[PDB]
Scaffold this active site. Structure first.
Site, PDB file in Angstrom:
ATOM      1  N   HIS A  60       0.823  -1.318  -0.202  1.00 52.48           N
ATOM      2  CA  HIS A  60      -0.180   0.183  -0.091  1.00 52.48           C
ATOM      3  C   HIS A  60       0.817   1.154  -0.042  1.00 52.48           C
ATOM      4  CE1 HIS A  60      -0.224  -0.196   4.530  1.00 52.48           C
ATOM      5  NE2 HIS A  60       0.320   1.256   4.327  1.00 52.48           N
ATOM      6  N   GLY A  72       2.796   6.499   9.186  1.00 53.88           N
ATOM      7  CA  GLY A  72       4.253   6.549   8.984  1.00 53.88           C
ATOM      8  C   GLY A  72       4.772   5.158   9.559  1.00 53.88           C
ATOM      9  N   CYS A 122       3.760   2.028   9.294  1.00 58.51           N
ATOM     10  CA  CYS A 122       3.955   0.802   8.456  1.00 58.51           C
ATOM     11  C   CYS A 122       4.994   0.302   7.824  1.00 58.51           C
ATOM     12  CB  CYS A 122       2.678   0.904   7.333  1.00 58.51           C
ATOM     13  SG  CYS A 122       0.907   1.196   8.029  1.00 58.51           S
TER      14      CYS A 122
HETATM   15  C1  LIG Z   1       0.722   2.771   8.544  1.00 58.69           C
HETATM   16  C2  LIG Z   1       1.204   3.609   7.315  1.00 58.69           C
HETATM   17  O1  LIG Z   1       2.175   4.321   7.545  1.00 58.69           O
HETATM   18  N1  LIG Z   1       0.809   3.631   6.183  1.00 58.69           N
HETATM   19  C3  LIG Z   1       1.122   4.767   4.950  1.00 58.69           C
HETATM   20  C4  LIG Z   1       0.566   6.069   5.726  1.00 58.69           C
HETATM   21  C5  LIG Z   1      -0.836   6.016   6.132  1.00 58.69           C
HETATM   22  C6  LIG Z   1      -1.402   7.176   6.444  1.00 58.69           C
HETATM   23  C7  LIG Z   1      -0.551   8.213   6.580  1.00 58.69           C
HETATM   24  C8  LIG Z   1       0.444   8.580   6.023  1.00 58.69           C
HETATM   25  C9  LIG Z   1       1.206   7.349   5.700  1.00 58.69           C
HETATM   26  O2  LIG Z   1       1.194   9.619   6.213  1.00 58.69           O
HETATM   27  C10 LIG Z   1       0.075  10.268   6.980  1.00 58.69           C
HETATM   28  O3  LIG Z   1      -1.118   9.541   6.867  1.00 58.69           O
END
Ligand SMILES: *CC(=O)NCc1ccc2c(c1)OCO2
Ligand SMILES: *CC(=O)NCc1ccc2c(c1)OCO2
Lengths: 304, 304
Positions: free
Chosen positions: A41, A143, A145
């Site tokens: 993702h 962030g 993930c």
């Molecule tokens: C869990 C993760 O970090 N996924 C990518 C992501 C999801 C939401 C989000 C961001 C990255 O930056 C801000 O919001």
């Protein structure tokens, strides 16, 4: 003496964390040999997440669209593939800090350390368990993930988890390092409800043994039980059934303490039925289920 | 979302752990620059420990009596001195993995990560607090002495604790990295009783804020209180007094959640008076006091 929720030393995993950017999405990747593993993702907008077709999204992506940074140095991406829900980014440099490693798919009840990371940088390490509903109760912000769960056997890191998402209930779901989700979860921003978060009975018993070893004995009673009798009580209290395999696994703790497993079961039975009455065991007012029998032996014997 | 007892990533400290042997005593040392710091009781027999004269014991010791091993390589000891209750062993090699570091003496209530070590080898990492009675509740077996407590500010390790001994009650005492014990403890195998282990009120409040931030709100009540009123209840419940300095420290959490500090105090008051009634907050049946306000901000904002 004393008994702590204890993570593995994180250094070997710290040396593997990188930042992966695809367009405006930044998350963490795991650099082992010349492969960077990250959640697929990374290619999605938050819009894409509502109903992503990853094969179709990936067609629009070249090697040069994956920005991989290890410290403040960029790695050259020379290949990319999707394996289940992870991307494998081939890079032109083998991670010089690659530890001996395995990828392992753990069973529910199994504990592991998480190295929470943001922009490829370690923020903290904590101990988790794969819940019987294949969620984990982590600490993960946007962030995080691509942060990984792991166990260490002397000098070999077994990676068992990569963080992918938070359910609407604020519990966590992710994959093994082959990209296969634990449980029925999918990397899509849709309603996904967890099943019953049952207590890991064998882990509770291990931790009761850990308590006796460390001098907390007030809950030891005069009773025994049978697996069948215990299991009726367990079921009533949303505890996982205890099998003879679990009894076998607890044998060494049984031997060390001279407390038959079924006697410790009868103690746990009374604790479920009677509650703690305001008392604590190893500084907890509830029965801890995030230590495995192996964890209790390790911490009680000082394995390095 | 989610809130975990979280240690600092341990890699920077793992790179500093060595084995120190003097005769038949083996424990851990901390190698920073060309100095190895270890508990001075490395020179003692378990017999010596009953009433050691360290200056007199040290006269019998030469540089070559201190065997320092970093991995499976021996370091050459070219000097030794006693500073309070630690030995400083000068070695001919600067630790190439020396991080930026400080030595800090922490206050009671302050949290830190412990890297539990045996024979200079990391076994695990956990989060601790300096108790108001200057003990810590660790997980330490024989061989663990010289294991260190630390905080990390980006790339600077602040070492605050070195493990020296377990009291007869199985709680832990140690020194700062200048060799000064926290509290009234001495490196002697004599009766040493801890004072009242009071609850770190400011830490509980921080953790109640952490709970509201992560969606656990059931305990928020309709009341407020005053510092004086709250403190009468706190004293009765063996909670540390709350000062205006503590209220100031909680300001950012107050602001983030829109819950006035004194309102959160009144919530804590009701929890003390009424108990949890079988409910949990952030998966705990008791009020957690081993997160600082700084810890809650760090974990809730994802500092690396
Ligand atoms: C869990 C993760 O970090 N996924 C990518 C992501 C999801 C939401 C989000 C961001 C990255 O930056 C801000 O919001
Ligand atoms: C806490 C520590 O490691 N101190 C040195 C030490 C004390 C007791 C003991 C050993 C070492 O080895 C066996 O017993």
């Amino acid at each position: 003496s004393g008994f702590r929720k204890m993570a593995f030393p994180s250094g070997k995993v710290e040396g593997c964390m990188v930042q992966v950017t695809c367009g405006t999405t930044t998350l963490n990747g795991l650099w082992l040999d010349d492969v960077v593993y990250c959640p697929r993702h990374v290619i999605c907008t938050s819009e894409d997440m509502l109903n992503p077709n990853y094969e179709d999204l990936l067609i629009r992506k070249s090697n040069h669209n994956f920005l991989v940074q290890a410290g403040n140095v960029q790695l050259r991406v020379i290949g990319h593939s999707m394996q289940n829900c992870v991307l494998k980014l081939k890079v032109d440099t083998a991670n010089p800090k690659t530890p001996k490693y395995k990828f392992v798919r753990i069973q529910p009840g199994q504990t592991f350390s998480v190295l929470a990371c943001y922009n490829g940088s370690p923020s903290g390490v904590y101990q988790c368990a794969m819940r019987p509903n294949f969620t984990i109760k982590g600490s993960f912000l946007n962030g995080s993930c691509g942060s990984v769960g792991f166990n260490i056997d002397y000098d070999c890191v077994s990676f068992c988890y990569m963080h992918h998402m938070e359910l609407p209930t604020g519990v966590h779901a992710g994959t093994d390092l082959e990209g296969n989700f634990y449980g029925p979860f999918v990397d899509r921003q849709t309603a996904q409800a967890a099943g019953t978060d049952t207590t890991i009975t064998v882990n509770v018993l291990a931790w009761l043994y850990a308590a006796v070893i460390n001098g907390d004995r007030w809950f030891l009673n005069r009773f025994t039980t049978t697996l069948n009798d215990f299991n009726l009580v367990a079921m009533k209290y949303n505890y996982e059934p205890l099998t003879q395999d679990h009894v076998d696994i607890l044998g060494p703790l049984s031997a060390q303490t001279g407390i038959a497993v079924l006697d410790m079961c009868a103690s746990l039975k009374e604790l479920l039925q009677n509650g703690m009455n305001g008392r604590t065991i190893l500084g907890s007012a509830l029965l801890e289920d995030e230590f495995t029998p192996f964890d209790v032996v390790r911490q009680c014997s000082g394995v390095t």
